[PDB]
Each structure stands twice: as structure tokens, then as C-alpha cells.
Amino acid sequence: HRIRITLTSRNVKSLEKVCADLIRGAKEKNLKVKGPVRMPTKTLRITTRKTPCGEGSKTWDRFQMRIHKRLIDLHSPSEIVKQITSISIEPGVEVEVTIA
Amino acid sequence: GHQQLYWSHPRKFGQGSRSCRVCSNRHGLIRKYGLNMCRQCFRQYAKDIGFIKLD
């Protein structure tokens, strides 16, 4: 019954409107929900030389890749969650659902 | 026998064991986060993976 959604994304606004649309689904069917708990962003970082050889002034690319992570805790029946999680998801988002 | 010799020498560690999954090169290897892609190769495919330049 204490069922835990773990939303993880690259893109914010895509994951922000999904976690909002899942918390809609918790209020539309009127079951208690701990809000969208913001887990810290993970900035993956590759700092590589720009030059394919070593024959320029020592410049460096600094690539990032942000991984935003939200979690939603519900007190829900399992089938209501497997119904809501199907509805309106987009490629930027990655959804887990832990039972217990 | 040659079948024993041909590939006898161990390839379990060192930059002669691992190579680029694109380039097939024994140099400029980015191992971090299980990329295993050459420093030229990843500089071409950074955008396509999701590695934006910002700071």
C-alpha cells in the first residue's frame, strides 16, 4: 500500500510536468501522497582536450550531463498506480515503481 | 602448437586489453561512467549521448 515511484530524467520540465501529472492522478482518485521529494541533481562531467592531436594551445571541453531525480510516496492500491503510471509519459522521463 | 601461442599473451588489464567501442583505438580512452569511447570519438558523439557544453 505504501508504494514508491522513483522518477529520474535528463530534462527538468519533462520530469516536472510528469511528477505533477502523477500527483494529479493521486488527487483525481483522492488517495494521500507525500509530495514530489527532490533528490539532488547528478552533474556527470567529462573534461576532454578539444584537439584530436596536441598541436594547439591547451584548451579543454567541459561536458556536463544533469540527471534530475524525484520520488513520489503514495498510500495507494497497486492497480490505481499501474493505471496512472501508463497515462501521458514522454521520452525524457524514466519511471520505477517499488511495491514495498 | 600455434593454436596455444596465437593469442596466449594475457589481455585482462592495461590499454592493450581495452579499446574504443567506436574508434577501435588503444589511446585517449574515456573509461568514466562506462563510456569506453575515444577522446576524439566522444567529442563527436557527446551531443548524441546527452553531454551539453554549459560551463
Binding site: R10, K42, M65 | Y33, D48, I49, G50
Partner: peptide
């Protein structure tokens, strides 16, 4: 996964697939 892949590795491997 059965060997249970890391989240940071997952989003890298997902990008490498697309590539």
C-alpha cells in the same frame, strides 16, 4: 537488471544506444 546497473551508467548507456 539481474547484475543491477548504476543510474549514472544507465543514462550514459541509453545515450550510447541512441548514438
Amino acid at each position: 537488471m539481474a547484475v543491477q546497473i548504476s543510474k549514472k551508467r544507465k543514462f550514459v548507456a541509453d545515450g550510447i544506444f541512441k548514438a
